[PDB]
Design a protein around this ligand. Structure first.
Ligand SMILES: NC(=O)c1ccc[n+]([C@@H]2O[C@H](COP(=O)([O-])OP(=O)(O)OC[C@H]3O[C@@H](n4cnc5c(N)ncnc54)[C@H](O)[C@@H]3O)[C@@H](O)[C@H]2O)c1
Length: 547
């Protein structure tokens, strides 16, 4: 079967709110969107839109029948019950992959999955708001722009980024970096992955000659004309060579699969084929050689850091692996979350995502221009919107992501609702986000690692986020376990609300798009961040325990 979101202005559901849910679950399985839709897999290996095909078919059946005062419960991708609520409550409540903590393991998940009892929601797979690769590209752009703002007055022209890994997430770095105004040198050991990124226009050039790569980079930095270059090789060899050469990248990071020393990171001096064979004969030797290689790479990263260059981790655990392998100074440079993302979270600045249910790209282009009107002094935002139009291809329903703070989300949502009402877009707009927002994630090895107060693992917050978005009038609300970092390691919440042009939706939008980022300002003010405390006061939040 081939699934895609219905289009245009005719609806099959009883109203546009449940029509939106119908379109969004189908869009998650669009062959231009999903990684393996035949198995209902949206992204992330096992992130599914529904538990199985019987469940998918029944979800579609229920969504077309739900009245505006009925609410469907989704339990790990299964439509288990419909109950009467009211028009100002969500039409769907979703809880995916949640396991009592001592059972929150892949071993138990798999046992339950084999019995037909489980589904992995990842983040946006089980909660029907996945929009393809734009999420990763935009998020990587956001990080590079945050680094540019912090270190270079927002200007990367004539500068270049050194990184490694062109995989499922790392492959976004060339495009994100050049969109951000920098040239990019990315080390990658798999030639087939390089060739794929070349074919799909995610990468400009590659070579196995490091000197040639540098001459290309320097020529582009001279011309102030960003280029992306992949060097075929091993980051544990190339990074120390670049240190020895005295070259001057303006940002250094890494997205090798360092989190997986057995199956991910290629040891120094090994071929891909040798790694394949050694994993079958001697897994412990593979792990040891990989971690020792990571220590060599991190030692080089530290030398750039010692020379005053901004160096940051990109959430792949490479510092801890290198530390364990003997690089005792591994943590002298920061992770990208505490350095760049958490300060944005402290102002409720986070992923703001919207989807044109009409299917018409002109709907998104109209909303792009409107965002630029509403936030006129934001060059990195305007540049992103302009560059996304020509560089980012829509997948399934046209959609857009940008990062928007507590001060502005509701303004944008209400403007979108007005555009639906006055026909400046052809059909209603779905507004949501991934689950990685200021108030909606507890993930002590990633987004809440190293909180000032040590509250990394407190998961009250995403549960309150979901309950409050339910209370506030979101169209569907989701509570998920284990997205990104796997079973046992995160708890997070999603929210989607439909702007259908009505005054009733306007009231809901004004609450949800304020309250949802405000919970993140609250959460970070609670942890002690003055940036968040200041933001709370600027937005007149009622935080009873805050002075
Ligand atoms: N939000 C975040 O925290 C965030 C964002 C992006 C990436 N990451 C992390 O970055 C890592 C990469 O993610 P991915 O999805 O791209 O993984 P992936 O497994 O798809 O890609 C890793 C890439 O590294 C390459 N590689 C392995 N060893 C290498 C070496 N020695 N030298 C050069 N290249 C090498 C592999 O060939 C592969 O293409 C993961 O740990 C991921 O969690 C995190």
């Amino acid at each position: 079967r081939v699934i895609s979101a219905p289009r245009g202005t005719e609806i099959q559901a009883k109203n546009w709110l449940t029509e939106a849910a119908l379109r969004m679950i189908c869009n998650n399985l669009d062959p231009n969107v999903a990684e393996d839709p035949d198995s209902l897999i949206v992204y992330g290996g096992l992130g599914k839109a529904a538990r199985n095909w019987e469940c998918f078919d029944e979800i579609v059946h229920v969504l077309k029948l739900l009245n505006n005062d009925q609410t469907l419960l989704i339990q790990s991708g299964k439509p288990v019950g419909v109950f009467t609520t009211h028009e100002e409550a969500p039409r769907i409540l979703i809880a995916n992959s949640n396991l009592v903590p001592r059972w929150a393991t892949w071993e138990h998940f798999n046992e339950l999955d084999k019995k037909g009892l489980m589904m992995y929601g990842q983040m946006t797979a089980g909660s029907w708001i996945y929009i393809g690769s734009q999420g990763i590209v935009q998020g990587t752009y956001e990080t590079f722009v945050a680094a540019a703002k912090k270190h270079y007055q927002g200007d990367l022209s004539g500068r270049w980024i050194l990184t490694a890994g062109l995989g499922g997430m790392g492959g976004a770095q060339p495009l994100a970096g050049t969109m951000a105004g920098a040239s990019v040198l990315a080390v990658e050991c798999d030639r087939q992955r390089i060739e794929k990124r070349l074919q799909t226009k995610y990468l400009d050039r590659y070579t196995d000659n490091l000197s040639e790569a540098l001459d290309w980079i320097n020529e582009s930095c001279r011309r102030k004309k960003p280029v992306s270059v992949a060097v075929l090789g091993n980051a544990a060899e190339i990074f120390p060579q670049l240190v020895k050469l005295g070259v001057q990248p303006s940002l250094v990071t890494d997205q090798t699969s360092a989190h997986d020393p057995l199956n991910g990171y290629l040891p120094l001096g090994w071929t891909l084929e040798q790694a394949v064979e050694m994993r079958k004969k001697s897994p412990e030797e593979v792990v040891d050689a990989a971690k020792k290689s990571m220590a060599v790479q991190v030692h080089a990263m530290l030398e750039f850091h010692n020379r005053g260059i901004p160096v940051f981790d990109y959430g792949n655990n490479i510092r801890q692996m290198a530390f364990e392998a003997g690089e005792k100074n591994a943590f002298s440079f920061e992770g990208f979350v505490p350095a760049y993302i958490r300060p944005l979270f402290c102002e409720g600045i986070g992923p703001f995502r919207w989807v044109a249910l009409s299917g018409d790209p002109e709907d998104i282009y109209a909303t792009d221009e409107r965002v630029k009107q509403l936030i006129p002094d934001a060059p990195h935002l305007h540049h992103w919107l302009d560059m996304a139009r020509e560089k980012i291809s829509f997948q399934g329903l046209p959609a857009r992501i940008c990062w928007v703070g507590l001060k502005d989300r509701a303004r944008l949502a209400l403007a979108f609702n007005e555009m639906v009402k006055n026909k400046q877009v052809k059909a209603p707009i779905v507004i949501g986000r991934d689950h990685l927002d200021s108030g909606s994630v507890a993930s002590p090895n990633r987004e809440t690692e190293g909180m000032l107060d040590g509250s990394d693992a407190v998961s009250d917050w995403p549960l309150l986020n979901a309950l409050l978005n339910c209370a506030s009038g979101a169209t569907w609300v989701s509570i998920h376990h284990g997205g990104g970092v796997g079973m046992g390691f995160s708890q997070h919440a999603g929210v989607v609300i439909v702007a259908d042009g009505t005054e009733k939706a306007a009231k809901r939008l004004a609450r949800v798009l304020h309250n949802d980022p405000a919970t993140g300002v609250m959460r970070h003010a609670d942890a002690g961040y003055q940036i968040a405390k200041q933001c709370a006061k600027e937005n007149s939040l009622w935080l009873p325990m805050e002075s």
